[PDB]
Structure formats: C-alpha cells, structure tokens
Design brief:
The structure is a homodimer of 234-residue chains.
Chain A (H helix, E strand, L loop, with lengths): L17 H8 L12 H12 L3 H12 L40 H8 L7 E3 H18 L7 H17 L9 E3 H10 L17 H14 L17
Antiparallel strand pairs in A: 1-2
The complex binds a molecule of 6 linked components (NAG-NAG-BMA-MAN-MAN-MAN), a molecule of 5 linked components (NAG-NAG-BMA-MAN-MAN), protoporphyrin IX containing FE (2 copies), palmitic acid (2 copies), 2-acetamido-2-deoxy-beta-D-glucopyranose (2 copies) and magnesium ion (MG) (2 copies).
One magnesium ion binds next to loops of chain A.
PDB class: oxidoreductase
Keywords: peroxidase/peroxygenase, heme, dilsufide bridge, propranolol
Assembly: dimeric
Chain lengths: 234, 234
C-alpha cells in the first residue's frame, strides 16, 4: 500500500494510454490525472516501470502539444486524434467510427486471442495483431490514417507492453498474457498475479530492435499519401 | 535601464528567431540563452512585447521538441530544420545551401528594399517579400520544402514583426522600417529610435486576420508533396 491501485472515479482524467492510466491508478502520477508535466512522467515511468528518460522525454513533449497549458496536460487531452493518438489501436476504436479514448473489449479480442496455445504474447504475435488491427481499420474505416509514423508509433506501443509487462527479462520481447490482459483491461500493475517492475532499464536502445522486428514481421504497407503530419495543438 | 541591451558573448546561445534573441539580449530571457522553458517564454514575451500566452504556448511547446531536455531548450536548438525552422526565411539562408542560424544581410536585402517610397513595412509589402523569398529558394535550393505549414509559419512570423515592432497600434499591420531593421540586424529593441512596447495585447485573434491577409496577397502555391510532417526531436 505504497502506490496501491484504486479504480479511477468521475474526478479522474484518463486517456488512451494504458501506460500512463496505470501509473495514475497507482499514484505514481496524480490520481486525478491532472496537471501532469514531462518531468512528472519521467519520474513516474522510472518508478513504476523502470522506463528511462530518453523515451519518456521524446514522447512526453509530443504529448504536451495536446493541451492548452504551458507545460502540463490532463491525461484525457492525449486522445487528440493525429498528434499521437492513431487508428488501429490495440484496445480502442478508430475516432472516425467510435470511441478512441476508452478500453474496448470488442477491439481487444484480437490481442486476447493472439499467440494461440502459448501463455505469452511475443514479437511474432504482436506483429500479427498489428497486421490484423490495421486490416480491420482498412476494411471498416473510410477515413483511416496509416503512415510510416503511425506504424512506428504502433510498434513502439507493442514494444512497450511487451517489455514493461515482462516476467524478468525485457530483452526477450515477450510478456505473460495474464499480466498484459490485466494491464489493458484494468489499467493495473498485476502484482497479485506475479508481476514485478523490471530490474533492467527500458531504454531507446533496448526497445529499438524489438520495434523494428515487430514492424518487419507485420507485413506492413502505407495507405494514401503516407504523410507523417501531426496535429500540433488543440 | 532594468533591461538594457547587451551583445551576446561567444558562449551565449542564440537561435534563428529575432524575437527570442532580442528578449535574451535585454535580459527578459536569460542572457545566456540556456535553460529556457515555455513559462519563461510566456513571461518574457509579455514583459518585453505584450505578446500573450496563447501564441507563446502554442509555438513554445513546438520549440521544446528541438532539445533533448524534459522541459527546456537552448535558443540555438531552435535551428533544428523542419520543426519550426524553415526555408525561405526573411533573414537567414536555407540550411541545404547555407547558414540557417545567423542573421544574413544579403538575404535581408529583399525585406530591407521592400515597400519602396514608404517609411513603413506593411501587409502588402510583407506579402511581396514572402513571394520573392520563396521564389529565391525555389530557384536556388533543390531541396526546398514549401508546404501549407511552412507558409503559415512564414506569414505568422511576418505578422509578429509587423505587430511587435509597430509604432504603437499593432492592429494597423504596419511597422516603421527604422524599428524593424534594428530588430533584425541587431536583435535589439529600438528604444533610442523611438519604439515602445505595445499597450495593446498581441493575441491569436489579433494576429490571425493579419496572417491570412499576408498569405492571401503573396500569390502562394505549394511545392512537391505538400506534406506538413515536422521533425519531432533531435
Ligand atoms: C511466439 O510464440 C509462438 C508460440 O509459442 C512461437 O511459435 C512456436 O514455436 C515453437 C518452437 O519454439 C514451435 O514448436 C515446434 O512445433 C513443431 C511443429 O510445428 C508444426 O505443427 C504445429 C502444431 O500443429 C497444430 O495445427 C494447428 C495450427 O494451425 C493447431 O491449431 C493445432 O492445435 C496443432 O497444434 C503448428 O502450429 C506449426 O505451424 C507447424 O505446422 C515441432 O516439430 C517442433 O518439435 C521439435 O522441437 C521440440 C522442441 O522445441 C522438440 O521437443 C521435438 O522433439 C521436435 O524436435 C516444435 O514443437 C511451434 O510450431 C511454433 N508455433 C507457431 C504457431 O508458430 C514463436 O516462435 C514465438 N516467437 C518469438 C519471436 O519468440
Ligand atoms: C503599403 O504601403 C504602400 C506604400 O505606401 C501602399 O501603396 C500605396 O498606396 C497608395 C494608396 O494610398 C497609392 O497612392 C495612390 O497612387 C495612385 C497612383 O499613383 C501613381 O500614378 C499616378 C498616375 O496614374 C501618378 O499621378 C502618381 O504620382 C503615381 O506615380 C494615385 O493615383 C493616388 O492619388 C490619388 O490619391 C491621393 C491621396 O491618396 C491624392 O493625393 C491624389 O491627388 C489622388 O487623388 C494615390 O497617390 C500608392 O500608389 C501606393 N504605392 C504603391 C507602390 O503601390 C499600400 O497600399 C500599403 N498597403 C497596405 C495593406 O496598407
Ligand atoms: C510510461 C510508459 C508507457 C507505456 C507502457 C505505454 C504504453 C502504451 C500502449 C501499450 C499503448 C497502446 C494502446 C492501444 O493500442 O490500445 C499506448 C498508447 C498511447 N500512449 Fe502510451 N505508454 C507509455 C507512455 C506514454 C507517454 C509518455 C505518452 C505521451 C505523453 C503516451 C501517449 C500515448 C497515446 C496518446 C496513446 C494512444 C495511441 C493510440 O492507441 O491511438 N504514452 N501507450
Ligand atoms: C516572442 C515573440 C516572437 C517574435 C516577435 C518572433 C519573431 C520571429 C520572426 C520575425 C522570425 C522570422 C525570421 C526570418 O524569417 O528570418 C522568427 C523566426 C523563428 N522563430 Fe520566432 N518570434 C517569437 C517567438 C517565437 C517562439 C515562442 C518560438 C519557439 C519557441 C519561435 C521560434 C522561431 C523559429 C524556430 C524561427 C525560425 C524560422 C525560420 O525563419 O526558419 N519564435 N521569429
Ligand atoms: C530510429 C528512430 C525512429 C524513427 C522516428 C521516430 C521518432 C518519433 C517517435 C514517437 C514516439 C511516440 C511513441 C511513444 C509510445 C506511446 O505512444 O505510448
Ligand atoms: C498563429 C497562426 C499559426 C497557427 C496555426 C496552427 C498550425 C501551427 C501553427 C504554428 C505557429 C508557429 C509560430 C511560431 C512563432 C515563430 O515561428 O516565430
Ligand atoms: C491544473 O490544470 C488546470 C486545467 O486542467 C489548469 O487550469 C491549471 O493551470 C492547473 N493547476 C495548477 C497550475 O495549479
Ligand atoms: C536533395 O535534392 C535532390 C533532388 O534534386 C535529391 O536527389 C536528394 O536526395 C535531396 N537530398 C535530400 C537530403 O533529400
Ligand atoms: Mg487510437
Ligand atoms: Mg529558416
């Protein structure tokens, strides 16, 4: 009960990111999800997950674009479509055809059914999930955006769940299904289930080869103009 | 003299922006040009120029992308091509064929020679300068990037000099050449010359119509892909 999980209430701003929502649900970020700066994210990700400042500064400062404040966000601000938030999410619907903010079990069923027969999700299953989620958006969302940039972000996010939710060695690029499923469905660290914070720092160099391998295995191709333009403010 | 002008020394960081360079040269920002946050920019723009937080937050957080630090920059970081820094600057060269950081009088000649006959720069002369600057980059720089985004940034920068360096009413969209020329060439507030800080707040809604008019008068068209992708980190 240092950093216990407590379910968020109506007082609590939450976003499209399970990583940050979980940190807030354990009080590594403010539980109300407000007034969050990049230094706060940096410290929270290190304390909660052993994720290092390199990736969190890079993504954090892009995230700051989504608010109207000088140096902070509310977590829900991160839903802003086209800054980071993208189509073919693992657990959220595409904004053109649904709710791009909240966990969605119908969408999540693709990830939950992946790597059949195994007790982990891994790099090859993550790649197949990405391929299938993108195929679903291509089929059902006429306004889909799929670019080099969104594809990179998507593989990054798969690498993030694989490493932060791992069972001992984030380099392996695999994580127990029981941990990953709690993380997405509950936005809770699966401590009773047996998860522990990584004892290896999770950095850009550690992630990079995992990201590239997921991409390579996903049989990806760009759509439309393939323009990597982001939304720069609300 | 609470904020006297002093020349930057060899170790004081300066960037491609006359606005921020000038604030630093008067001590409204740190004279060394380092460890500058968005709140510092907001307060310095207000004190120095009566520019309000809406525009400075917007632009400031984009500028924060250009460093590796969590919530600050050095001014020189802002030279990072393709975040904000762009080709067809009013006083710098294009990075592919020259120095995109320091004031260059040969580039500035176009602006300095504009609105012939008159003692002010105005919206129509700013538009003609933009047109001519972009023509120069189209002719001489094979790697030119010219998009909806760069063109908007350019018109915004024109509107910034026109309003901040005005003879006291920024809504007029005109500024004494004597003040504007000092601002660019020296990065100094032209106080001895008779300028004073606007008594009218300079805001997004004050700027916006000026920006659109400059763009409308500049006979602009896009080049290439017309992709507004920015560089998101060094
Ligand atoms: C992410 O995890 C996935 C899943 O764990 C990893 O993929 C698996 O890798 C293991 C190797 O570590 C492979 O095991 C080998 O399987 C060989 C037989 O493969 C064929 O048969 C499989 C079974 O038949 C299935 O049919 C359908 C599938 O359509 C199923 O629904 C049905 O229930 C049957 O199960 C097929 O799934 C597969 O495609 C092949 O057709 C065995 O020959 C091999 O045995 C050798 O090795 C053993 C030790 O490893 C040894 O004890 C034996 O003596 C023998 O020498 C071994 O068991 C799995 O095939 C493979 N599964 C998949 C789905 O690819 C994946 O590598 C991992 N990724 C990363 C990056 O880590
Ligand atoms: C940005 O700043 C520029 C420069 O100041 C402005 O451009 C000038 O705008 C004024 C309008 O105010 C123009 O002045 C007008 O010029 C007309 C044409 O003048 C030339 O041609 C005639 C022959 O046809 C000659 O007689 C003359 O000497 C010039 O060679 C004149 O016909 C107009 O004269 C009438 O109006 C004035 C009062 O304005 C009366 O004094 C006259 O008696 C007569 O009734 C007038 O002089 C000037 O031409 C513009 N210059 C240029 C280069 O375009 C931009 O408008 C301004 N932009 C913005 C957005 O504010
Ligand atoms: C701290 C470690 C972090 C972890 C483990 C993590 C994990 C993830 C995961 C797995 C997703 C994918 C959700 C999905 O596809 O349904 C995601 C999405 C997202 N993350 Fe993070 N994240 C972290 C940090 C960040 C940071 C620092 C930011 C920005 C400040 C951020 C912003 C987002 C956004 C905007 C999305 C939504 C993208 C989308 O699916 O459309 N995350 N995150
Ligand atoms: C405070 C009021 C400001 C004023 C009056 C101002 C003014 C200007 C002007 C006139 C230019 C054009 C220089 C040229 O084309 O040669 C410029 C360029 C630039 N400004 Fe500012 N600016 C201000 C604030 C900002 C802020 C807040 C940022 C980012 C944190 C910023 C970043 C830049 C950059 C990167 C350039 C270079 C663009 C280029 O010409 O390639 N400026 N500024
Ligand atoms: C080898 C460099 C990769 C190519 C360029 C990628 C630089 C921008 C990456 C944006 C990272 C944002 C993803 C953070 C994870 C999240 O979204 O939860
Ligand atoms: C105020 C007009 C621009 C706002 C339109 C939204 C698209 C992003 C705008 C970027 C504004 C950047 C201005 C920076 C100031 C500077 O460059 O000197
Ligand atoms: C917290 O965030 C609110 C908006 O959510 C903002 O107005 C305010 O700046 C923040 N509180 C502070 C700085 O104490
Ligand atoms: C610059 O322009 C030429 C086309 O004229 C191209 O071949 C080259 O790749 C470009 N350089 C960069 C860095 O894009
Ligand atoms: Mg999404
Ligand atoms: Mg430039």
């Amino acid at each position: 009960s240092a950093h216990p999980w407590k379910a968020p209430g109506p007082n609590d701003s939450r976003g499209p990111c399970p990583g940050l929502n979980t940190l807030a649900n354990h009080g590594f970020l403010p539980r109300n999800g407000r007034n969050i700066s990049v230094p706060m994210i940096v410290k929270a990700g290190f304390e909660g997950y052993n994720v290092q400042s390199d990736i969190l500064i890079l993504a954090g400062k892009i995230g700051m674009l989504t608010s109207r404040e000088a140096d902070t966000i509310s977590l829900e601000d991160l839903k802003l479509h086209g800054t980071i938030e993208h189509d073919a999410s693992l657990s959220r619907e595409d904004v053109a055809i649904g709710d791009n903010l909240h966990f969605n079990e119908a969408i999540f069923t693709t990830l939950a059914n992946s790597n059949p027969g195994a007790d982990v999700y891994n790099i090859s299953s993550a790649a197949q999930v990405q391929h299938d989620r993108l195929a679903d958006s291509l089929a059902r969302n006429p306004n889909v955006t799929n670019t080099d940039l969104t594809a990179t972000i998507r593989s990054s996010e798969s690498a993030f769940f694989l490493t932060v939710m791992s069972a001992g060695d984030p380099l392996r690029g695999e994580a127990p299904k029981k941990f990953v499923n709690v993380f997405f469905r509950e936005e809770r660290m699966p401590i009773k289930e047996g998860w522990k914070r990584s004892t290896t720092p999770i950095t850009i160099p550690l992630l990079g080869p995992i990201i590239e391998r997921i991409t390579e295995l996903s049989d990806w191709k760009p759509t439309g103009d393939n323009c990597g333009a982001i939304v720069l403010s609300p």
